[PDB]
Design a protein around this nucleic acid. Structure first.
Ligand SMILES: [Zn+2]
Lengths: 108, 149, 49
RNA sequence: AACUGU
RNA sequence: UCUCCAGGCAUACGCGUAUAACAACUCGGAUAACCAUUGUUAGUUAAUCAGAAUAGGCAAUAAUCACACUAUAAAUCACCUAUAACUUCUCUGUUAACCCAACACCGGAAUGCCUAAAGGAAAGAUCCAAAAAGAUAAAAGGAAAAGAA
């Protein structure tokens, strides 16, 4: 079955310009205090998350080199230490990861 | 028609879902923080919490050893669960896993993204939300009400 | 008294370590070839450039 | 005839 | 690294640079990632692999592990006699995920070895509508198992 006649632009225009078919505005936009960038109320910041995710790779890269092989996951707890920080007695008996950078302000 | 459903349909079948969940659980244990789709992350959150209980049960438990071996493909992790994860969560009675929403992937599919991590980990803290301080005008007004009461 | 599983690569995985484990399984069969001629046959039954 | 949601 | 799949490798034929590196992100891939796209530069190595004198004389009896043994469809130049020449290694083929089907077509495509050590990925996301298709399961009964004519 094919259309019996051409559909008029006016009829077509009304269909596409009906409110149901139009793009709706969003009121859930929020600001990120940490980075000062926009975010949604139910969505986290990304500018700061970029630092966190990349820092994780840098920390993970250090971990990968230290292990040196697959299936080498330690059976003991692990800790990350940055330059200017010295291991404590409580840190004994735990895998220690050394980071050349200083302790990040956000990281505690 | 998803009324009363308590299980998500993932993978190519129920076995694939277990294997896909098994792979996700193994990866999470190794790294302690993994980013995945929100639907899949929610489904696997319950499994991770129960796994910590199995570690708490004890190494000598035959069921735990069988459970740990099946769920963890990489066998180096089996000592870790009983000697790293289980000792860490001994004080905790639950809520071992923290799941939060991440901005959706800009990969042309706009999948809902979430991050699931084990609490008490050595990884850098996630950017968690901070509640409003009591110094705010509304809270201070409520503080005055509290003092009167 | 915990029967910890061996820390080895999974046989069915698609990786270098898994491939080596699969290679060892065949190499065990070669070690299990009694006759010298069978050893030669197994080693030479496939033609390669 | 059996067989099975025919 | 993990999960799972199980025709792979050589030659022929055909194709003719689709090969490889770099740089691009417009066009091409029926979307991206990435390139198979665009531009530039590079490539395939052979005395061993492959392709590119004359005149006379004379021939009964297959193979089949060829012996026995039979059979019927009836199944192999040589070597002698003369003549002629008289010290040689160049040329060409060699790449590729490739061909015939208007297409990056669920089609067609010879031989040898071997059957996973080789070769691979069904999941763009979310929802779990109805209806429809495919698959699995059936209380009691058995046309409302593999047995006979
Ligand atoms: Zn921020």
């Amino acid at each position: 079955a094919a259309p019996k006649n051409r559909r008029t632009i006016e009829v077509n225009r009304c269909r596409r310009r009906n409110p149901q078919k139009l793009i709706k505005i969003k009121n859930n936009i929020d600001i990120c205090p940490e980075c000062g960038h926009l975010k949604q109320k139910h969505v986290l910041c990304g500018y700061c998350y970029e630092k966190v995710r990349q820092e994780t790779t840098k920390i993970r890269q250090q971990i990968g080199a230290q292990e040196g092989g697959p299936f080498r996951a330690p059976s003991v707890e692990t800790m990350v230490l940055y330059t200017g920080e010295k291991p404590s007695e409580k840190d004994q008996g735990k895998r220690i990861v050394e980071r050349n950078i200083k302790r990040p302000s956000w990281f505690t | 028609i998803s009324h009363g459903r308590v299980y998500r349909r993932l993978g190519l079948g129920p076995e694939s879902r277990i294997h896909l969940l098994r792979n996700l659980l193994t990866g999470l244990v190794r790294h302690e923080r993994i980013e995945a789709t929100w639907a899949r992350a929610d489904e696997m959150r319950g499994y991770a919490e129960k796994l910590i209980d199995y570690g708490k049960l004890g190494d000598t438990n035959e069921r735990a050893m069988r459970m740990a071996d099946f769920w963890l493909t990489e066998k180096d992790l089996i000592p870790k669960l009983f000697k790293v994860l289980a000792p860490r969560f001994q004080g905790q009675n639950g809520n071992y896993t923290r799941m939060l929403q991440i901005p959706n992937r800009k990969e042309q599919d706009r999948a809902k993204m979430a991050v699931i991590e084990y609490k008490g980990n050595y990884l850098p803290p996630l950017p968690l939300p901070h509640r409003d301080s009591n110094l705010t005008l509304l809270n201070q007004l409520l503080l005055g009400l509290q003092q009167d009461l | 008294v915990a029967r910890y599983p061996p820390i080895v690569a999974s046989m069915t995985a698609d990786s270098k370590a898994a491939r080596q484990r699969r290679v060892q399984r065949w190499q065990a069969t070669v070690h299990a070839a009694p006759s010298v001629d069978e050893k030669i046959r197994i080693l030479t039954k496939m033609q390669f450039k």
